[PDB]
């Protein structure tokens, strides 16, 4: 499913100024916007060409919203230090993620609104968009407040409404990239690895979206246990890269095949050395 997600990070830095707030937004695996409270004149800024075309009222309003959330998070960090009786000397992190996944009917499939403090879950909106999960006593304080304020009903309306509406708009305006997979460019390399063994490495480069599967089989059998697989990584131009490698006895290379599955391939590819 297509998805829109915002990732917000607020970090206190006592003795080094006020907390820094950074936010990025994505459609699927494409970033489209950033905001950084430490920038010279902090603004929501485009990072994809399909939102650069949104007009000046759009960017003014997004800027406004970011600035108000940054302010509120400086307060949030203070509050959290108090809830946990933390020292004023320590640095702390509050992270928030919210957004929506788009269903086949063009409506909300799943919405998200959740948070972590110092790397661990704090409070999250439940999948029913009606109720909250608080991880500890401090978070239960926020929960009770938010229950009494009907915060979940407000979030529900945003997630079902605006969030999906904007996602759909972005997907249409960006369709040539967001709705069109770029297939992986694939090849195999061979690296003699001792006097009698060799590494075969199956490469997938230049692909979008990031989801991919690379597997080595020997005699048609998955070598799951003996395959080194790196984590899929960004190329830096909006595409991704991955490889999988296996160490084989020299001369047995022909029994090995690399299998590539990706949404941009109509049938899985097989490569061989």
């Amino acid at each position: 499913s297509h998805s829109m997600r915002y990732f917000d990070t607020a970090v206190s830095r006592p003795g080094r100024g006020e907390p820094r707030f950074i936010s990025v937004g994505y459609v699927d695996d494409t970033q489209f916007v950033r905001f950084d409270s430490d920038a010279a004149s902090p603004r929501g800024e485009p990072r994809a060409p399909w939102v650069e075309q949104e007009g000046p009222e759009y960017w003014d309003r997004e800027t406004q919203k970011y600035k108000r959330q940054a302010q509120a998070d400086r307060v949030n960090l203070r509050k959290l230090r108090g809830y946990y009786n933390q020292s004023e000397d320590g640095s702390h992190t509050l992270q928030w993620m919210y957004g929506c996944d788009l269903g086949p009917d063009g409506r909300l499939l799943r919405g998200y609104d959740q948070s972590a403090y110092d790397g661990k879950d704090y409070i999250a909106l439940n999948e029913d968009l009606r109720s909250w999960t608080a991880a500890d006593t401090a978070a239960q304080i926020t929960q009770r407040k938010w229950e009494a304020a009907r915060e979940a009903e407000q979030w529900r309306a945003y997630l079902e409404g605006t969030c999906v509406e904007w996602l759909r708009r972005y997907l249409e305006n960006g369709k040539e990239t967001l709705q069109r997979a770029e297939h992986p460019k694939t090849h195999v390399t061979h690296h003699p690895v001792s006097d009698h063994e060799a590494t075969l490495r199956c490469w997938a480069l230049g692909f979008y979206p990031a989801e991919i599967t690379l597997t080595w089989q020997r005699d048609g059998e998955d070598q799951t246990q003996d395959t080194e697989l790196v984590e899929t990584r960004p190329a830096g131009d909006g595409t991704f890269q991955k490889w999988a490698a296996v160490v084989v006895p020299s001369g047995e290379e022909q029994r090995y095949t690399c299998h590539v599955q990706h949404e941009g391939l109509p049938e899985p590819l097989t490569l061989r050395w």
Binding site: Y158, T162, C163
Partner: peptide
Amino acid sequence: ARTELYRSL
């Protein structure tokens, strides 16, 4: 686009 709903803990 961002929500208008600001988190206040």
